[PDB]
Every structure is written in structure tokens, then in C-alpha cells.
Amino acid sequence: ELTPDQQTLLHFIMDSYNKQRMPQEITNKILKEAFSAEENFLILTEMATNHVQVLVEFTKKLPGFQTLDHEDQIALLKGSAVEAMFLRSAEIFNKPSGHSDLLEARIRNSGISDEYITPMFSFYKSIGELKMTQEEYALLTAIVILSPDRQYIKDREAVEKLQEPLLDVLQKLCKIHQPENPQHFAKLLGRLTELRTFNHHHAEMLMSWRVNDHKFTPLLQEIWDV
Amino acid sequence: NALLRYLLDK
Ligand SMILES: COc1cccc(-c2ccc(NC(=O)C3=C(C(=O)O)CCC3)c(F)c2)c1
């Protein structure tokens, strides 16, 4: 029961969500470079950088985003960056496992301890049990970005109006893709709550890295306010 | 936020 307009919305969001890449050059490094804390962090830097470029490209195309106040635009972009990144990592993680073990080993050895890294992978497994389709990851990503709850937003109602149609769409998709589990939508929203705990967790990661003398490149410094 | 504004505006 998607409306015509909902189906158009959905196609548009899908087109933008897969206008993506894991560039090949970063895959090549993952699967081929030398292995040390130093190289692994450089690879991780590149990965984070790609996620943020992807996020920017996705964000700017979201229907209505260009109509928003320009400072709110930045507040939404910075406010969503951590959540959106870990959601995209969860999607990827849950899609070969040799490739996966090698990447996971790099992430676990990129200059901070396992108490910082394990919680990411528990989250990937947690959301993985949900068996979400690509459309669900895309709409959730849009809903994360268009959150009216972020810090510093001047016109929260304008953002709420852009988020509401996506939530309606996601609710209908949950019934299309998982018709036998009527709590699926509620479970997705429970995982969003889980995702939000990464904001604090990410900040502790950055802090540990920086005590360890790691530096962040320009885009990461700006997006995460280092 | 020059860098972010630059990327959002291109
Ligand atoms: C360099 O600065 C930082 C700081 C904090 C977190 C990260 C980070 C953490 C994890 C990931 N990625 C992943 O965990 C995974 C995937 C991915 O990004 O594609 C897929 C499998 C796991 C990632 F891409 C980046 C980087």
C-alpha cells in the first residue's frame, strides 16, 4: 500500500543510497597492505573519510534538505555523522568472511583497545539478526539524518516535516518485507536507540586515539569537531 | 565549517 508519491520517494531515496562506493582502492588496501597499528589506522581513516563523503552526497539529495536553513543543514550533517557511519558499517558487515576477518583484524588493531572495538561488532550482530533489506537501511539512514532532535537546530518543525513521510514509508515497508513479524518496525526503532549510544562511545574512541598521539585528517576533524 | 559547507554546496 505505498502511495504513488511514496513509491516515488522510495525510488529516489534508493537511487541516492546506492549511488555509492566502497572505492576499490580502499578494498585493495584492506586486503593487501602491511599490517600494523599505523597502517591499520591509515586504512580506517580512509574508510571513515569515504563514509563521510558518502553521507554528504546522500544528505544533500534528500527531498527538502536544500530548503532548510543553512546552519541547520550543518547541524544535521554533524549531528548524524556517527550514527550514519555505524549504520552503514552494520549494513556492510552483514552482507565474504575471509575479507571480513581481515578487515575486523585491522579495526581491532588500529591503535586503541578492544574494549573500544568490541561494542561496534556486537552492534553489527544485533542489527544483523533483524535481516533488514537494503530499502530498510536507506530509509533508516534518511531518518537518522533528518532528526529534529539534534543539537542546535533553529527550526525543528521544518525537519520534523521532512522526517515524517520517511517514517510512514518505513512502516509500510516493514509490512511488505516482513509480513509475518508485525513488531519489525518497533524493533528497527529500538535498534536506532541502540545506535544513538555510539555518539558517546565514538567520542571516547577519539579521545583514546588522541592521547595515543593519533591525528585525524581534515574532513574527520571538521565533521566530528576534533 | 568551511569544508563541510564547501562539500554540501558543490
Ligand atoms: C579513523 O577514525 C575513526 C574513528 C572512529 C571510528 C572509525 C570507524 C570504525 C569502524 C568502521 N567500519 C567498520 O566497522 C566496518 C565496516 C565499514 O566501515 O565498511 C564494514 C565492517 C565493519 C569505520 F569505517 C570507521 C574511524
Q: Please tell me if the CB atom of residue A52 comes closer than 6 angstroms to any atom of ligand 1.
A: no
- Yes or no: say if A60 and B8 are a contact pair by the CB < 8 Å rule: yes
Question: What approach was used to elucidate this structure?
Answer: X-ray
Residue labelled with grid coordinates 550514527: A83
**C-alpha A82 to ligand 1 mean position (Å):** 10
Nearest alpha-carbon partner for B8 in A18, A26, A72 = A72
Nearest alpha-carbon partner for A112 in A209, A224, A43, A220 = A209
With CB atoms and an 8 Å threshold, state whether A56 touches B7.
yes
Where chain A is discontinuous (C–N > 2.5 Å), the residues before each break are: 95
Residue labelled with grid coordinates 555509492: A20
Resolution of the experimentally solved model in angstroms? 2.0
- Yes or no: say if A44 and A120 are a contact pair by the CB < 8 Å rule: no
Q: All 3 cell numbers of residue A122?
A: 556486537
Residue A225, phi-psi category: left (phi > 0), alpha (psi -120 to 50), beta (remainder): left
- Yes or no: say if A87 and A195 are a contact pair by the CB < 8 Å rule: yes
> Angle at CA A31, nearest 5°, toward A26 and A35?
100
Give CA–CA dist A197/A38, Å, rounded.
Answer: 27
Architecture of domain A1-226: Orthogonal Bundle (1.10)
- Domain borders along chain A are 1-226
Contacts of residue A46, defined as CB under 8 A and 6 or more positions apart, other chains included, come to A26, A29
Contacts of residue A206, defined as CB under 8 A and 6 or more positions apart, other chains included, come to A216, A224, A226
Give CA–CA dist A173/A175, Å, rounded.
Answer: 5
DSSP secondary structure string for all residues of A149-179 = TSTT-S-HHHHHHHHHHHHHHHHHHHHHH-T
Sign of CA dihedral A177, A180, A184, A186: positive
Q: Please tell me if the CB atom of residue A42 comes closer than 6 angstroms to any atom of ligand 1.
A: no
- Yes or no: say if A124 and A93 are a contact pair by the CB < 8 Å rule: yes
